[PDB]
């Protein structure tokens, strides 16, 4: 029977002859009995009761480390976990009909708009938010300007050493960062001084003057870009972060601004915003490179040739749609054009027999989920926060937000003092890592390892800090928090099968899109070497 054991059942299994019932044991039985009388309570209340039961059980095992009932109580703890999943699957509430996209730090491009429009076209019953920051359209411009200039400065120092094997990609990225870090410090010191002098100044005011003073950019041209950026986003369901009061007043806002203003990491700032948006409003978050799910039975008459993978086939399906329906102009066909004419004709025939977009892409419709959960997309590498589904104020959305805040607290506790010493990049790194390592233990070891690379994020190969800070790891940790009836998990022991309990159905997203499959590029050593080599070729052309 799937239902959680009752008091009498627990008494039997946790029975030890000749042992009196301790106060700590009775407490468990009492709470278990209370749980079974809670049929009229809310899901969250039921969960909190289960949490209390687990806590009381842990207190017993810790108090009487030798007790004969520990074996049975450990089995009981397993039953509690199963009950959480049962509670999750059996009590569903409607998901608010909102689609959330995020595009901050610069002008939204046409490709993003075209993808978003696909969702709009088949989900007319959904409100669409494309979150942007009206104060910070120039952050990407700033980063690109600083980085490009730094690349060019660095390569000039390589001029007489191009055949020297010591002047490798490693040296390049190291030397480049010395310059980038110095500029980042210069900028943030300027930002802080400007804010002190005139608190009415917004990010873009300070950035544009900085760009004019430091890199001879024209304020007039930057003003035009801001205007064009604002107009483009507001005409495409723009939702300004600067009007998101709950976000601005919460404990995540300073983390958002840390990433936006100090680190110029738009991906990380997006990570922080998206889950706060989902928590506060409810609905479905999507990356702008996701497309609506294909109708399940659309291509059932076409079977896959043996000379191609599932990933090749999935990409081909979308490319066929875009070739013959032209929903997105300029969509690739490189995978479709590799097929035999017999199957290309098979695609053309199927799609010709279809009239409306609603016959090709499915609609999200009435969705429901547990008040406990956030659902997440999966790819071949595991969970990925490119797709999220949650009811407003779901327990897990709260757990995820808290995971991210706690991770940043650990980071900033060591990072801020390190930075404040006002040394160069390498010295700051060493100070920071030494500080982080002093707080490392068996529980947080792998996490702390990645944290130590924070300042390298986006500028060096083999850096996974973001996923550990604001990305998938924080989500896995929240799921562990839920299933282990705790908060602040650092050591992820959950595996795929555990996480699949929270998966978004494959029918609800097309993940194998042109934009996505191009962004599965991983910045590893090989990629870094190739990038260095491309930079050198461009830079030294002529002689």
């Amino acid at each position: 029977g799937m239902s959680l054991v009752n008091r009498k059942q627990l008494e039997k299994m946790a029975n030890v002859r000749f042992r009196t019932q301790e106060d700590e044991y009775v407490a468990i039985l009492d709470a278990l009995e209370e749980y079974h009388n809670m049929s009229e309570n809310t899901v969250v209340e039921k969960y909190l009761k289960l949490k209390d039961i687990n806590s009381l059980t842990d207190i017993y095992i810790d108090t009487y480390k030798k007790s004969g009932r520990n074996k049975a109580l450990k089995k009981f703890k397993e039953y509690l976990v199963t009950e959480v999943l049962e509670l999750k699957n059996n009590n569903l509430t409607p998901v608010e009909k909102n689609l959330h996209f995020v595009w901050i730090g610069g002008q939204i491009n046409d490709t993003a708009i075209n993808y978003i429009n696909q969702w709009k076209d088949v989900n007319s019953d959904y409100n669409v938010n494309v979150f942007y920051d009206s104060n910070a359209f120039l952050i990407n411009t700033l980063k690109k300007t600083v980085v490009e200039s730094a690349i060019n400065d660095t390569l000039e120092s390589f001029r007489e050493n191009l055949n020297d094997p010591r002047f490798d990609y490693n040296k390049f990225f190291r030397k480049r960062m010395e310059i980038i870090y110095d500029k980042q410090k210069n900028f943030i010191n300027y930002y802080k001084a400007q804010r002190e002098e005139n608190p009415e100044l917004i990010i873009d005011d300070i950035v544009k003057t900085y760009l004019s003073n430091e890199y001879s950019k024209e304020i007039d041209e930057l003003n035009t870009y801001i205007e064009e950026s604002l107009n483009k986003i507001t005409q495409n369901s723009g939702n300004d972060v600067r009007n998101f009061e709950e976000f601005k007043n919460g404990e995540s806002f300073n983390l958002y601004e840390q990433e936006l203003v100090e680190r110029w990491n738009l991906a990380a700032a997006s990570d922080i915003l998206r889950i706060s948006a989902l928590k506060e409003i409810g609905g479905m978050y999507l990356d702008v490179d996701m497309l609506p799910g294909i109708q399940p039975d659309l291509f059932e008459s076409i079977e896959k040739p043996s000379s191609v993978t599932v990933d090749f086939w999935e990409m081909t399906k979308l490319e066929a749609i875009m070739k013959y329906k032209e929903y997105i102009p300029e969509y690739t066909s490189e995978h479709f054009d590799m097929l035999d004419e017999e199957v290309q004709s098979s695609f053309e025939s199927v799609l010709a027999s279809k009239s409306d977009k609603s016959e090709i892409f499915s609609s999200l419709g009435d969705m429901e989920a547990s008040p406990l959960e956030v659902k997440i997309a999966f790819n071949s590498k595991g969970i990925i926060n490119q797709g999220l589904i949650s009811v407003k104020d779901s327990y897990c959305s709260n757990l995820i937000v808290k995971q991210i805040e706690n991770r940043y607290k650990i980071l900033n506790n060591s990072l801020n003092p390190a930075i404040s010493e006002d040394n160069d990049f390498n010295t700051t790194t060493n100070t920071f890592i030494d500080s982080i390592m002093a707080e490392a233990n068996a529980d947080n070891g792998r996490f702390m390892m990645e944290l130590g690379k924070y300042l390298r994020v986006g500028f060096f190969p083999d850096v996974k800090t973001t996923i550990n800070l604001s990305g998938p790891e924080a989500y896995a940790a929240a799921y562990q928090d839920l299933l282990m009836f705790k908060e602040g998990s650092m050591n992820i022991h959950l595996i795929e099968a555990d996480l699949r309990n929270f998966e978004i159905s494959k029918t609800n997203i097309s993940q194998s899109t042109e934009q996505e499959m191009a962004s599965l590029w991983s910045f590893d050593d090989a990629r870094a070497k190739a990038q260095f080599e491309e930079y050198k070729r461009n830079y030294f052309e002529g002689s």
């Epitope: 490009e148 200039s149 060019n152 390569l155 000039e156 890199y215 001879s216 930079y535 461009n538 830079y539």
Partner: nanobody, 119 residues
Framework: SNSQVQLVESGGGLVEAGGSLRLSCVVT????????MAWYRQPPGKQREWVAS???????KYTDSVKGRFTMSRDNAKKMTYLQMENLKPEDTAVYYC??????????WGRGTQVTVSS
């Protein structure tokens, strides 16, 4: 190479040994302020050689044979670079070219300006 960037060098000619000469280069396009500017020269019979560079970060370098004699400058507002040559020697005779170097948007070169030093 970046086709949207053009460079026009000027100021070359015939000059006496020990004399001074200033070359100029005007640059078009929008990459000047984030690029490195460089001067080169191709002496008769020999391959083109590097002379001087001035990075967008403000670093100046010179080839050894020219140190103490040549002065390179750059002006982001005017999008111009200059090579001031002093105490000119016969071995300085060459076609002098200017280049904008950019790893991101690409590099562009001028067609050069000839300098002949008498002796």
């Amino acid at each position: 190479s970046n086709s949207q960037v053009q460079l026009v060098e000027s100021g070359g000619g015939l000059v006496e040994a020990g004399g001074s000469l200033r070359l100029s280069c005007v640059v078009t396009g929008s990459s000047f302020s984030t690029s490195t500017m460089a001067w080169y020269r191709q002496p008769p019979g020999k391959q083109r050689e590097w002379v001087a560079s001035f990075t967008s970060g403000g670093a100046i370098k010179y080839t050894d044979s020219v140190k103490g004699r040549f002065t390179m400058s750059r002006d982001n507002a005017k999008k111009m670079t200059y090579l001031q040559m002093e105490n000119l020697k016969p071995e300085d005779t060459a076609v002098y070219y200017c280049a904008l170097h950019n790893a991101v948007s690409g590099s562009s070169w001028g067609r050069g300006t000839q300098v002949t030093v008498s002796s």
